[PDB]
A = this chain, B = another copy of it.
Amino acid sequence: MAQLGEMVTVLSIDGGGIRGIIPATILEFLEGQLQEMDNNADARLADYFDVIGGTSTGGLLTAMISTPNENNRPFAAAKEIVPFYFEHGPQIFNPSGQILGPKYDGKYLMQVLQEKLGETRVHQALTEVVISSFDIKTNKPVIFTKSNLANSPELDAKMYDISYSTAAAPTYFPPHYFVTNTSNGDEYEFNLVDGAVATVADPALLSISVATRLAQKDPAFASIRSLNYKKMLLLSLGTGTTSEFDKTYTAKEAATWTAVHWMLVIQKMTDAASSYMTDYYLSTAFQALDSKNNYLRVQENALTGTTTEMDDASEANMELLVQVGENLLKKPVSEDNPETYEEALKRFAKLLSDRKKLRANK
């Protein structure tokens, strides 16, 4: 069939705590477009993307739109995500007041994840999912994927363990300990923290890489088997970075900072660096293959005020976050390219819809 048909589609969502409201707003717009284009209100993101990767709240989002419900359909529609944040956000980011330990005990977060995810396991995901985390015990990143588990049943973990882990940010939530089982029945232990610690606050390159590897044995992904980025369609969503005119710093003032001052901001800096670097790696690859337009990165580069914190679940801040999300749609994709993200996304939507159709026709 046409080149479009054989293409591999990937969606990636950055971490960012409540800032997940931003990519959620974008995904809401995208799923709506797809539903409108295919005249099917039942259309869900997972029906168009072969791979969906997420880190932190991006991972929670991934779990919700990829976990099968009783009807074997995505547990949640994109439009349900922001409301999830407004309703549970304040209870998830509710200060425990503990002298020692993190800012939040994470009890409520796990409660809700169990409530909605149930006992679903990653092998049941409706598409290939890639959810990141870092094991502070083995000192290695642990990437939960849907495929491959055939041999390693220890990685076929429960969605709520995976979801809590990917969002367990140091100093914010308690790292997570849960147990799984090997082939021989032996116990397999996990000691996980946020995927940002694993260097993948922006998991788009990790997602494409997982797909490339799968192509070594999954005929479905045979098309990008030899790193052919020309057949790769990638939508990568960020949760925004701090404006240089906001909470940013000079070497002069950082002189007298203590370790706690550095811990209070070091995470935001690496998240911003991850957004920059990952985008740099990908733009380099896609451009080198004259496929610049195959990769759409939707990111806000100028967050100000309360909006910068992944911690603020106040009514006023979540509302501002919805606003940056709505406004992002109105911003342009690049410089001297008047095209807005909204139009680019519509184009992306059309490609997803057409591909699904071609996959059906042939």
Task: Report A's interface with B, CB cutoff 8 A.
Answer: 2-3, 230, 290-293, 323, 326-327, 330-332, 336, 338-340, 343, 346-347, 350, 354, 361
6 contacts between A and B (CB under 8 A): A3-B327, A290-B332, A291-B330, A293-B330, A336-B339, A338-B343
Choose from B2, B290, B332 the contact partner of A331 (Cβ within 8 Å): B290
Contacts of A336 in B (CB 8 A): 339
Q: Are A347 and B343 in contact (CB under 8 A)?
A: no
Secondary structure at chain A's binding surface: helix, strand, loop or mixed?
helix
Chain B residues with CB under 8 Å of A290's CB are 330-332
A350 and B326 form a contact (CB under 8 A): no
**Nearest neighbor of A327 in chain B, beta-carbon distance:** B3
Query: Which residues of chain B come closer than 8 Å to A338, judged between CB atoms?
Result: 292, 343, 346-347
Complex: A343 Cα to B337 Cα, angstroms = 10
Query: Copies of this chain, how many?
Result: 3
Chain B residues closer than 8 Å to A293, beta-carbon distance: 330, 340
Q: How far is the CB of A144 from chain B (nearest CB, A)?
A: 34
A330 / chain B contacts, CB cutoff of 8 Å: 290-291, 293, 350
In the complex, what's the smallest C-beta–C-beta distance from A27 to chain B, in angstroms? 16
Which one of B3, B323, B326, B346 lies within 8 Å of A323 (CB-CB)? Answer: B3
A210 to chain B, nearest CB (A): 25
Alpha-carbon distance A338/B346, docked complex (angstroms)? 9
A339 to B346, CA, bound (A): 11
Q: Are A3 and B326 in contact (CB under 8 A)?
A: yes
Residue among A323, A327, A330, A340 having the largest count of chain B Cβ atoms under 10 Å: A330
Complex-state Cα separation, A339 to B339, whole angstroms: 12
Q: Which chain B residues border A331 with CB–CB below 8 Å?
A: 290
Give min CB distance, A154 to chain B, whole Å.
42
- A2: which of B3, B326, B343, B361 is its contact (CB, 8 Å)? B326
Hey, which chain B residues are within 8 Å of A339, CB to CB?
Answer: 336
Closest to A339 in B: B336
Chain B residue nearest to A323 (CB atoms) is B3
Cβ-closest chain B residue relative to A329: B3
A230 CB contacts on chain B under 8 angstroms: 327
**Please, how many angstroms separate the alpha-carbon atoms of A282 and B350 in the complex?**
30
